[PDB]
Amino acid sequence: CTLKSFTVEKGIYQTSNFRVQPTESIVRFPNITNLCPFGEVFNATRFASVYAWNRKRISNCVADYSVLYNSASFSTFKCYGVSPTKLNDLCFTNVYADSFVIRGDEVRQIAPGQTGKIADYNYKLPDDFTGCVIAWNSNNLDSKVGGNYNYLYRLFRKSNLKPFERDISTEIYQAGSTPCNGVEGFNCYFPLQSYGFQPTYGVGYQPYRVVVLSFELLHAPATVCGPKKSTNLVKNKCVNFNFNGLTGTGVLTESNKKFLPFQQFGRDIDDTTDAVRDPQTLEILDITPCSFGGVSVITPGTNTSNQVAVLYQGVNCTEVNVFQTRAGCLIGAEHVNNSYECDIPIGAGICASYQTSQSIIAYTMSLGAENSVAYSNNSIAIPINFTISVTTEILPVSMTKTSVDCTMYICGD
Amino acid sequence: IDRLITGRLQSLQTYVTQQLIRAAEIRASANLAATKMSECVLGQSKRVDFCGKGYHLMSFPQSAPHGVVFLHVTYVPAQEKNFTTAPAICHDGKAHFPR
Amino acid sequence: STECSNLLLQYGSFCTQLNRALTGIAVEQDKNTQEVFAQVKQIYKTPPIKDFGGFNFSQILPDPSKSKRSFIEDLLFNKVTFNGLTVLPPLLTDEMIAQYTSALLAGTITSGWTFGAGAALQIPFAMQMAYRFNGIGVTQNVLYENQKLIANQFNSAIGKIQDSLSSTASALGKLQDVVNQNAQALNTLVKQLSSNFGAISSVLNDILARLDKVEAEVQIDRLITGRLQSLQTYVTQQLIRAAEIRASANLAATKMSECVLGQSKRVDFCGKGYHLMSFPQSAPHGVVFLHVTYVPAQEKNFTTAPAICHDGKAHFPREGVFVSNGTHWFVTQRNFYEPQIITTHNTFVSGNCDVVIGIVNNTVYDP
Amino acid sequence: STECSNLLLQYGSFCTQLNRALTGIAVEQDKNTQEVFAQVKQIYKTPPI
Amino acid sequence: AYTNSFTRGVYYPDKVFRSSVLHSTQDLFLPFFSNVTWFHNPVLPFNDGVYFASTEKSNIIRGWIFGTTLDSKTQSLLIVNNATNVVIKVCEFQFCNDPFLGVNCTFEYVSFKNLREFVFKNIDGYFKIYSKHTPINLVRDLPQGFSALEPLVDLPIGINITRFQTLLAAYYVGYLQPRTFLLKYNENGTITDAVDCALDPLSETK
C-alpha cells in the first residue's frame, strides 16, 4: 500500500512512523489556599433588609461553587447565562454576592427582566443576567413573636429601578393630588414598610434569606477563580502532563538540576522545555520525549518470498526473533555470527539478506577478505601473464524534457 | 479559489525548485560523461581508475536511452611470481642501475 | 494535537514529499562515504617488522592500544568537536572507515601503485620510491645516493604535521564548518516553532483553549502554513547543501584513485611540487590526504645551448639539457644538477650546424 | 514602515536567514576569484628586452 | 544632580531556568552607561517603568506611592515597610502633600553598608517588583559591577500609573526603555553578565 503496487522489489522501505502513546494524564497545581469566606455571605446571624441589600465584593481569592450547589440547605438554587456545573472551571475580574430577607411568596421576583414590588422598588435583574440565585426559609431566624417589624422593604417609589440599582433614599411618596410638605398625609406615604414576620405564618408570608451571585470580567485581571484540581504524579512512564499552565507529553524523571527559588520551568538551547518544578512538592523533574521513529520493512522482494523483517529506527526494544541493533530494534531477522557483503543496508555496520527453509538474517558487514601482503626487504613480485578486461560504465546524460504551463496547471479553462 | 491558487502555486514552486536542483545533478554527470569521452575514447588516460580498473588500453561508446555506456578495455596483470631483487649491481667498482 | 493533524491532511502530498527528499539526502551520505573509502578489494595489512628503507610510517599506521586509528587520525578526531527531529547513524562506522584507510595505506606502503590495477604486487619501499622519482623525470640513482637524507626529510616532515594538528582547531576548518552549518540549520528549524505566523498564539493548546472550533481552525491554519513553509525552507536548503558535499565527495574519491592509488602528472592536484605519493587519514565527516612531493630548493645559473656542433653535425640531448660551468660543457638531467660528459650515447645527431639558432662549437666523446 | 515591520517579526527567523544566505553567496565570489587568479606567489616581471 | 548607571539594574525577565547559555531578550531595561538622577521628596514621572536604588544603614526610606493623580480622585498604590515587613494597599488615599514616617481597598497584602536596588513596571494590569540587596564601599555613586535583580511580587490590580513619590538618605532614579540585551547564564542558572545591544557597534557585533 505504501508503494501503490502488488509487486515489491528487494529493499528497505519506510512504511510508517512509530510513537509511544501516553499511558495516562497528569495535572499539577499549587495547594488549594485563599478559599473565599462564603460563611460571611450565607452563615452570618445578621441579615439585610431588602431595600438596603448588603453586597460583598470578592477579589484576589478562589471561590468554590460546588459547596453551594451540592449543599442540601437551600430551598431554591437557580442560574442564568451559565451552567451551574461549569462555574468551578471559570475565572472573573470580580464576583459579587448580594444578600437580603423577603417573604417566601416574593422570591420569584428575583429573576431576569421580572417585575413587582420587590423587583421594581428593591432589587432588579436584567433581561440577559449572568449569575445565580440561592434562597432558603429563615422563619426561625428572621420572624419573632409579636412581629419582627425591624425588617423593611420599599413599598413606594417614583419610578422602577434599573438593573442592579441600589437605593436607600428616604423620599416620601405622593400617591394623591396634593403635595407632601416632606411628611406623610392623605395619600402621601413614607417609602419603607415591614412584613411584621412571625413564626406562626404560612410559608408564603414566612421570611426567606436570599443571595444573588453576579460575575464580572474585564481587561482588568481575572482576580477570582474556581478551585484547581490535581492528580497524583507518575515518574518513569510516557504521560500526558500539565504543570500550572504548561501542557506537554513526555517521560517525567527525577533530576540533578538546581533551579533558583523563583524559577518554575527549564529550557534547552532550542527553547524546548526540558525540566519543570512540581508546584506541590518542590522537586525538579526532567522531561524527555516519548520514544518515536520511522518503521521500515526489510524485504527480499515479493518474487522470492513473503517473509519480512521490521526495523523500528532509533527505538529500543523495551519501548516496542527480536534483536537490538545500534540503528534500532530489529524484529523477524535472525542474528548471524558470520559476515558477508552488505545486501540490504540497515546502519551502524549492520546489513540483512535472505539465506539458509530459508529466512532473513542480520549480520555485521564484511569489508573484504584480509590479506597480509608478503612484503620483504629484498623481494619483488612480477606478473608472468595478463588478462585483457572489459568493464561497463553507465552514466546518465539528460532528463526527459518537460514543460508545465502554470496558467493551466493552477486554473485550467 | 484563492485557497486553491495559493496551494497549487506552492505545489508548483516546490516541483520547479527540485527539478532545478536535479538538472544540476544531471549536468554534473553530463560534464563527466563528456570528459570520459574526450579522455578515454578519443585518447588513452593515465589517470588511475578514471577509465576502468587495471591499466587502461582504450574504450568504446555505446548509446543508451537518457545516457551513455563506456566499454573500458584495460590490461590486468594476472600470474605473479616472487623474485629476489636489488637497486643496483657492482661491476668494476661502479654501480649499474637498470635503464 | 489530533485536531491539527486533521487540517494538515488538506495539504495532501506535502509531508510525504519532504520525507522522500530528506531520505534521498540521507541515503546519499553512505554512497559518498563508500565511493571515497571502499576503493580497495581486500583489507591489506602490514608486515610485522617495519624495514621500509628508513622511512617511518608509525604515526600514520594503526595503533592497537586505541578504535584502531593512527596517531594522526586521533588528532583529527579530537580537533573537530526532538520535535519530530531524528539523526540516523552512518552505514560505515568510524571503526570501519579506519579499517579502509588502514587497508589503502598498507597496500600503498607494501606494493606501490600496483594494488589499484589488480593484485597487490609487493616491492621494497626503497625501490618503490626509486620508480616514483623516475616518474617525475629525476633519475633513480638520485634516490639511492641520497636515501638517508630523503628518509630523514620525510620523517621530519611528518613530525611537522603532528605539531601543526596539535597546535590549533583552525587546521580542520572545512569539517568544523560542515558540522556548524548543520547545527545552525536545525537550531533555526526548531526556534521557528516559537513564532506566531500571525496566529493569536504560537501554542496550539492555548489556541484550542481561547477559541471555539470555527475560530480555532483559522488560527491553527496560520501555524500550519508557517510551520510547513519553515520545513520546506529547511529541506530546500539541505538539498542545496548536500549537492556541495556530493561535489566534494566526488573530488575526494578522485584523489583516492589518482593520487593515493597512483602517481599524478596533473599539476598542483596533489599539492605543490612534483608529486611522489600521498597517504589517506580519516577525519570526522571527511578525508585528509598527506601529499608527499619533490620540491627543488637551491639553484645555480649556467650558460646553455640548444645543440652542439661536432664534425659539422648538430648534436641534441636525448634526456636532459646542455650547460657550462664557464670552461667546460656538460649534459645534465633537468630537475637536479648531475653533469655528465657529452657523448654519442647521451646525444643524437640531426642535420648540419647552419640551421639551429644559437648552436655552440664543442666536442662529443665517442667511447 | 514601522507598522509593517512589527507584523514581519511574527514570521520569526525567515528574514535573518535570507540575509545570511545572500551574504554567504557574496563572500564566495571573492573566493572563486582567488582560487583562479591568486595561484602565483610572487608578482613576476618580464625583462626590458 | 546626576550619576552614571554603569552596568547596574538588569533583572531576570522570566521564571525560566537556563544554564551555561547566552539568551537574547527584548524588554523594558535601564540602558547601560545611562544617566540616573541622584537625590538626598518630589513627585516624579513613571514613564515605561522605574529603576530605583538607595544606599542605606539606618532605614530613612520606608516605601513608595504610585498612581495617576497620586491623590484621592482614583485608586493609588501605597507600599510601606511597617518595620516588621512590607505592607501593600491600593486605596484612593487623601494623604499628605509632604508624606513621611519619623526618623477604596479593592486589594491589600502583607509580605552606609547596604545598597538596595528595585525595579517597578506595570504591564497588562500586573504590577511587578524586582530587587537585590548587596554590600558597598562608596556613598556618592552606584558601584561599578554586575548582579541581576530577582522577582519579589506580581500583583493583579489593573490600576493606571503615571507618577510616583518616595516615603522618607541618598537615592537614585532611572527610567526603563524597550532594549534588546544578551544575557549570560552560568552552570547554576544565575545571570552573570550582559550586553546592551544598542550601546555601541562592538555590542551590536556581540
Ligand SMILES: *[C@@H]1O[C@H](CO)[C@@H](O[C@@H]2O[C@H](CO)[C@@H](O)[C@H](O)[C@H]2NC(C)=O)[C@H](O)[C@H]1NC(C)=O
Ligand atoms: C503542599 O501540601 C503538602 C501536604 O501537606 C506539603 O508537603 C508535606 O507533607 C507532609 C505529609 O505527607 C508533611 O509532614 C510536611 O510537613 C509537608 N511539608 C513539607 C515542607 O514537607 C507541601 O509542602 C505543600 N506545598 C506547598 C508549596 O505549600
Ligand SMILES: *[C@@H]1O[C@H](CO)[C@@H](O[C@@H]2O[C@H](CO)[C@@H](O)[C@H](O)[C@H]2NC(C)=O)[C@H](O)[C@H]1NC(C)=O
Ligand atoms: C641539501 O639540502 C639539505 C636540507 O635538508 C641539506 O641537508 C642537511 O645538511 C646539514 C649540514 O649542512 C645536516 O646537518 C642536516 O642533518 C641535513 N638535513 C637532513 C634532513 O639530514 C644538504 O646538506 C643539502 N646539500 C647540498 C649539496 O646543498
Ligand SMILES: *[C@@H]1O[C@H](CO)[C@@H](O[C@@H]2O[C@H](CO)[C@@H](O)[C@H](O)[C@H]2NC(C)=O)[C@H](O)[C@H]1NC(C)=O
Ligand atoms: C665553429 O667551428 C666551425 C669549423 O671551424 C666554423 O666554421 C666556418 O666554416 C666556413 C666554411 O666555409 C669557414 O669559411 C669559416 O672560416 C668557419 N668559421 C670560422 C670562425 O673560422 C664555425 O663558424 C664556428 N662557429 C662559431 C659559432 O664560432
Ligand SMILES: *[C@@H]1O[C@H](CO)[C@@H](O)[C@H](O)[C@H]1NC(C)=O
Ligand atoms: C455554614 O455553616 C456550617 C456549620 O459551620 C458549615 O458546615 C457550612 O459548610 C456553611 N455553609 C456555607 C454556605 O458557608
Ligand SMILES: *[C@@H]1O[C@H](CO)[C@@H](O)[C@H](O)[C@H]1NC(C)=O
Ligand atoms: C535499551 O533499553 C534498556 C532499558 O532502559 C537498557 O537496559 C538497554 O541498555 C537499552 N539499549 C540500548 C542500545 O538502547
Ligand SMILES: *[C@@H]1O[C@H](CO)[C@@H](O)[C@H](O)[C@H]1NC(C)=O
Ligand atoms: C557467536 O559466537 C560467540 C562465541 O563466543 C557466542 O558467544 C555467540 O552466542 C554466538 N552467536 C550466535 C548467534 O551464534
Ligand SMILES: *[C@@H]1O[C@H](CO)[C@@H](O)[C@H](O)[C@H]1NC(C)=O
Ligand atoms: C611469495 O613468498 C612468500 C614467502 O615464501 C609467500 O608467503 C607468498 O605466498 C609468495 N607469493 C606468491 C605470489 O607466490
Ligand SMILES: *[C@@H]1O[C@H](CO)[C@@H](O)[C@H](O)[C@H]1NC(C)=O
Ligand atoms: C619511528 O618514529 C617513532 C617516533 O615518531 C619512534 O618511536 C620509532 O622508534 C621510529 N622507528 C620505528 C621503526 O618505528
Ligand SMILES: *[C@@H]1O[C@H](CO)[C@@H](O)[C@H](O)[C@H]1NC(C)=O
Ligand atoms: C642567477 O643570476 C641572476 C642574474 O645575474 C642573479 O640575480 C641571481 O642571484 C643568480 N643566482 C641564483 C642562485 O639564482
Ligand SMILES: *[C@@H]1O[C@H](CO)[C@@H](O)[C@H](O)[C@H]1NC(C)=O
Ligand atoms: C642571444 O642574443 C644575442 C644578442 O642579440 C645573439 O647574438 C645570440 O645569437 C642569441 N643566442 C640565442 C641562443 O638565441
Ligand SMILES: *[C@@H]1O[C@H](CO)[C@@H](O)[C@H](O)[C@H]1NC(C)=O
Ligand atoms: C547626562 O550625562 C552627561 C555626561 O554624559 C552629564 O553632563 C549630564 O549632567 C547628565 N544629565 C543630563 C540631564 O543631561
Ligand SMILES: *[C@@H]1O[C@H](CO)[C@@H](O)[C@H](O)[C@H]1NC(C)=O
Ligand atoms: C487606564 O487603563 C485602561 C486599561 O484598559 C485604559 O482603558 C485607560 O485609557 C487608561 N487611562 C489612562 C489615563 O491611562
Ligand SMILES: *[C@@H]1O[C@H](CO)[C@@H](O)[C@H](O)[C@H]1NC(C)=O
Ligand atoms: C554552583 O553550585 C555549586 C554546588 O552545586 C557550588 O559549589 C558553586 O560554588 C556554585 N557556583 C558556581 C559559580 O559554580
